[PDB]
Symmetry: C3
Subunit: 307 residues, 3 copies
């Protein structure tokens, strides 16, 4: 059985713990594991723009001994000239894993349904699970055991980061709160999956429109841009509902005195997060970005040896 | 004293056999040849979109120890800011071979006239010779000796795949048939070159509008998308009806991407005659063999 | 230690430039003998503008130092739009050991270098092209030996990146540099003054003239470049008539030293700034010059990495 990573709950709590431990080991010894020596190939396909995911996967694959074939948005978007299933079958003959940033989750599901190699979600409309592996590695290295920590996410509660912080966070035993305005709440199916997974780990799920209540006592405060490129023409004012949820100094003062701040980047300073918070002593955004490299190398090692 | 690969007949029958033998060796032992260790560079330039050619060349070059510099069609078109001859001279100072997917064959000829390193056609409007090397490797590993086999291509008989199956097929001793409607027949000078090469190998060339006759007794049945306007080609659809007419143990090939329901049906493409996935894999092995072979002769 | 960047030619002292150029000759002889980036370690190579020579030379050179170039080209969204240049520089510094960047305004390079924790290298900007001039100096040294006291004349637009870098990099090597350009197209005053100060240290000199024949006479090296960059195509000027007298043609080359060599960074517009006869003739060193982008930039990277 081939293991894929299309959503955070694809890993059990025990498996997630294995990946996060390998991530810590690979951060210490970054070229000690060469499962892709040869080089073996890995597909890294971008239907959307990327800086952090592009650099971290391309270099991480190289440091595992492999060669990343990076496909840009200049190539014809996949699924136009042939079925995604046909593409997955041919790519499986060239590479040992397929890393793909795309739109609908169903596109990832289609490729994983027929690929003979692991398929990894490098960002979809619905989830960003490699980002949250790096977030969890960052939280662990700054706070220790993840179980019982309180994490609050602020902004659009139905975007990929909100969904993956729910799923990935409760898998780690984190008490996850999503603070979002009315009409921007997590997908019900994702919320229910996080609630079921939380039963197994002692975690919990909270969804609230009360930003100050979400910030109070939190160990980790997280936010993300409020609007994806596909939502810019959706007809909504996507600024006025979110301003109460801005991660600013006043909000940070409400959290635990030792709280840290995460943001997957790119940040739009002055919108979802302020300069004072992002450049202040609680910010862990640069270590978080670095840990994309280490966490994704661990994920690849782990999937490859189980597939 | 420098060898290029712009069309299938650039290799003699004997040299094609050498490259195909190397392809089988490299498929068994994919990192056993490292002529590009260093790394030395290879340019891989795309004037137009690619999946299979991009992956197969980029990874194949890496597995020869080299480093492919992949130039995308999003980058400024080649020969727009300076002559192709100036580009060829400069690239020859950085890389040991130039792989190029373009349109007009005369562009490939211009590059190859001045480059001091091998130039390889990664797909042109006229030929797709690296695809046919992979096809020949696929046929060989399933049927053994190529000489005397019957291969039929169906559909648009005027495109690069039809031309290269003609030229590369007769170079291997294959009796090649193109089944195509009038107005979409092979270029006469390509057909004439194929008939000429066929005299040396025991091969032959047939061009027919009768898909049933072409399918009857065929050992290899091949098709490709119809446009690069569909009414003339429908009778040449590679479906279960035609396949039922072929020889026992016949192989089905399609260079990809496929438009399922047009030139080929799901039942044929997903059925037990289909070798389209091995065929696509063999782009990697056959192109590595081609590069090894060209580099040691250049 | 401090972090050394290479944004303009004078970022290297004369002694430091000599070290880089010596390393360039050593690496040309033994191209895989230095592996500071083995691992591989990453290097970012970002192109806000098109390139062939800089793209191939940096991507392969980095690989031959053992590293892995992450090449970002113009189809990926332009840097500075999705997030600040400073945020980008901080993030890249966590993934790579150096940042190579072809961009527009020099101030954009200054912004990344202010926050980056790794060397930033100018791979061509509006104001300078210092990696080209390192390759030019390597080529001249190959052909002529000692650079000190040679006479080099550049012809064409006196205010573009190649004129500025030939001034600064040339006098840093002890070369007497002349820029021959029509009035109105003269070097930036602050670059001219900086080159005059640096020339005083090396015994070199700076000359700026509208007299192309006088600039060619006695020269050891004649250099030109295209007259018009993309950003100037719509500046309203006739950018042909003023530059015709400055064309590097056979008549001009005949006025220089009988063993003079000809350089051109490429791409060339044959028939405008240079003629076929000159570019394809025996004085032309343009192909060696292009090849030396590989060697000189490898030397630069080795040198910066060991000091950062």
């Amino acid at each position: 059985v081939i293991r894929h990573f299309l959503r955070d709950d694809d890993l059990s709590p025990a498996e997630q713990a294995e990946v996060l431990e390998l991530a810590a080991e690979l951060k210490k010894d970054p070229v000690s594991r060469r499962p892709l020596q040869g080089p073996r190939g890995v597909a890294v396909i971008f239907d959307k723009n990327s800086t952090r995911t592009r650099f971290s996967f391309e270099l991480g694959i190289a440091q595992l001994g492999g060669h990343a074939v990076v496909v840009d948005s200049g190539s014809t978007q996949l699924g136009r000239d042939e079925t995604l299933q046909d593409t997955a079958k041919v790519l499986s003959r060239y590479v040992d894993a397929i890393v793909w940033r795309t739109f609908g989750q169903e596109r990832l599901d289609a490729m994983a349904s027929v690929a003979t190699v692991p398929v990894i979600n490098a960002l979809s409309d619905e989830f960003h699970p490699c980002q949250v592996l790096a977030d969890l590695q960052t939280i662990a290295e700054r706070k220790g055991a993840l179980r019982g920590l309180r994490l609050s996410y602020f902004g659009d509660g139905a975007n990929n980061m909100a969904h993956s912080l729910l799923l990935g966070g409760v898998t780690a035993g984190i008490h996850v709160t999503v603070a979002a305005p009315e009409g921007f709440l997590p997908d019900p199916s994702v919320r229910a999956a996080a609630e079921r997974r939380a039963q197994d780990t002692g975690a919990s799920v909270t969804v609230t429109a009360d930003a100050h209540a979400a910030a109070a006592g939190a160990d980790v405060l997280v936010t993300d841009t409020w609007t994806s490129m596909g939502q810019e023409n959706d007809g909504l004012d996507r600024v006025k509902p979110f301003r109460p949820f801005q991660l600013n100094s006043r909000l940070l003062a409400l959290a635990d005195s030792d709280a840290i701040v995460l943001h997957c980047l790119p940040a739009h300073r002055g919108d979802e997060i302020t300069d004072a918070v992002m450049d202040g002593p609680a910010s862990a955004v640069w270590d978080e970005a670095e840990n994309r490299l280490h966490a994704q190398k661990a994920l690849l090692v782990w999937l490859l040896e189980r597939s």
